Design a protein around this ligand. Structure first.
Ligand SMILES: *[C@@H]1O[C@H](CO)[C@@H](O[C@@H]2O[C@H](CO)[C@@H](O)[C@H](O)[C@H]2NC(C)=O)[C@H](O)[C@H]1NC(C)=O
Ligand code: CA
Length: 476
């Protein structure tokens, strides 16, 4: 629940309404285009925690918990949790306060954390902004508590972005005036109680760039746990400084060159390579960020390409990069939905197979990461070091000398040729035996210290000293 506690964590992000139904149906329709509640619940999550923990995740992030606008708007229901209007009540679509507290408990019984998604920027309302009935907003019952109505029109104008409203006149998002101490006192008091009541281990904080910076430190304090913010901008100059104000932020700077590097057989390794060092240098701490290539606000990775080799490579990058890996429910079943609402597919419709190609991959990656962290107290703080690149290849190093994991990633795709990469800079000793932990082969370092890395089928390669795996179950 502390920021240091979270560096070791590996997060599985899910939409409560779309992950698992109480009845456990794997056939119950959920048409993303309809934009309606499909019936996923907190209890549904509890009943599938074997499937989340089996990928070696240690934590889940759920969408917001507060009671939503009730209407079916022109844009559908508030299944997603981001249109709240009664913050001291729960959205009853997902279950009881008992059900929520019981989720936080099936998790803790499992040595797992609970992260909860929280909105402080705004409420939701059905209809135009000029028609908002603020008396519905518990406990922000008057227009005094809110910014004057306006739409955000130029994101370059950071003073709009914080003061004007998100959304449109079809679903408007009344923007709490987070400047005035009535709001600050209320939110801060709210969040600590939220955390206390449900035993929340950490918070993911929505739309952070839309609230002024000096609001957040008191919020992070008040919450009393690790907070990671959604600052949706690809520029490290813009997004990293928000770490000056809260523990982490989602690693959107990495997001874009990460996607482009692997979304086709000719993506730029250079851009990815350079952004890794950029974030290493310039963000306050790259090891407290969240790494992702899929979420609910962007087309899924597979919507760019169904090549499983490329999908394997990106999922590996996410687990083994600096910071906290964040896989989006569905990604492990190779979901291909496009932009919102097409990326909100129900997870149960996949049938939850634990032998799908990406679930075995993500499990192997989490497994070696969790095990390395077991044996190396420096692993989570040793900053990911990009040791090599070429046109189709990036290779990176993380871990204390003698225990480092060295990851070779490729974008040759699933029809790649078979050849041998001579990898310098990995730092191992001549003749040292290395286990490639995805495919469970061995590689030996050899006389000059370069590693002869077999390259086939566009597959990721994840190397770890074989002698250090004496205990584990990793390739046995
Ligand atoms: C956590 O639970 C407690 C009660 O179990 C909530 O306390 C209420 O808070 C409101 C503040 O708006 C008070 O006016 C009520 O009198 C309180 N009730 C009781 C029984 O003490 C607390 O707000 C809950 N926190 C959240 C975030 O829901
Ligand atoms: Ca705002």
């Amino acid at each position: 629940a502390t920021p240091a506690d979270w560096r070791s964590q590996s997060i599985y992000f899910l939409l409560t309404d779309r992950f698992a139904r109480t009845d456990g149906s794997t056939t119950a329709t959920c048409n993303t285009a309809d934009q309606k509640y499909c019936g996923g619940t907190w209890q549904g999550i509890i009943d599938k925690l074997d499937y989340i923990q089996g990928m070696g995740f240690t934590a889940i992030w759920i969408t917001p918990v507060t009671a939503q606008l009730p209407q079916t708007t022109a844009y559908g229901d508030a299944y997603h949790g981001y249109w709240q209007q009664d913050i001291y009540s729960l959205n009853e679509n997902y279950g009881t306060a008992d059900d929520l507290k019981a989720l936080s408990s099936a998790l803790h019984e499992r040595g797992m954390y609970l992260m909860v998604d929280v909105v402080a920027n705004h409420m939701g309302y059905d209809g135009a902004g000029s028609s908002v009935d603020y008396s519905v907003f518990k406990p922000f019952s008057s227009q005094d508590y809110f910014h004057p109505f306006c739409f955000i029109q130029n994101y370059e104008d950071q003073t709009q972005v914080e003061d004007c409203w998100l959304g449109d006149n079809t679903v408007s998002l009344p923007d709490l005036d987070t400047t005035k101490d009535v709001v600050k006192n209320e939110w801060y008091d709210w969040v600590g109680s939220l955390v206390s009541n449900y035993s929340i281990d950490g918070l993911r904080i929505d739309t952070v760039k839309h609230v002024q910076k000096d609001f957040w430190p008191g919020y992070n304090k008040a919450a009393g746990v690790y907070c990671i913010g959604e600052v949706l901008d690809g520029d490290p100059a813009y997004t990293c400084p928000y770490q000056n104000v809260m523990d982490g932020v989602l690693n959107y700077p990495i997001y874009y060159p990460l996607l482009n590097a692997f979304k086709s057989t000719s993506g730029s390794m250079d851009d990815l390579y350079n952004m890794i060092n950029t974030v290493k240098s310039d963000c306050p701490d790259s090891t407290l960020l969240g790494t992702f290539v899929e979420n609910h606000d962007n087309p899924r990775f597979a919507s760019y390409t169904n090549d499983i080799a490329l999908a394997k490579n990106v999922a590996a990058f996410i687990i083994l990069n600096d910071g906290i890996p964040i896989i989006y429910a569905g990604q492990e079943q190779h979901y291909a939905g496009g932009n919102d609402p097409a990326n909100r597919e129900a997870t149960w419709l996949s049938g939850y197979p634990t032998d799908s190609e990406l679930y075995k991959l993500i499990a192997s990656a989490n497994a070696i990461r969790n095990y390395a962290i077991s044996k190396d107290t420096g692993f989570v703080t040793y900053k990911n070091w990009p040791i090599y690149k070429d046109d189709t290849t990036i290779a990176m190093r993380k871990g204390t000398d003698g225990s480092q994991i060295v990851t070779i990633l490729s974008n040759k795709g699933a029809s790649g040729d078979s050849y041998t990469l001579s990898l310098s800079g990995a730092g191992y000793t001549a003749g040292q035996q290395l286990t490639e932990v995805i495919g469970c082969t061995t590689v030996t370092v050899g006389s000059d210290g370069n590693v002869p890395v077999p390259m086939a089928g566009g597959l990721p390669r994840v190397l770890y000293p074989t002698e250090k795996l004496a205990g584990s179950k990793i390739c046995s």
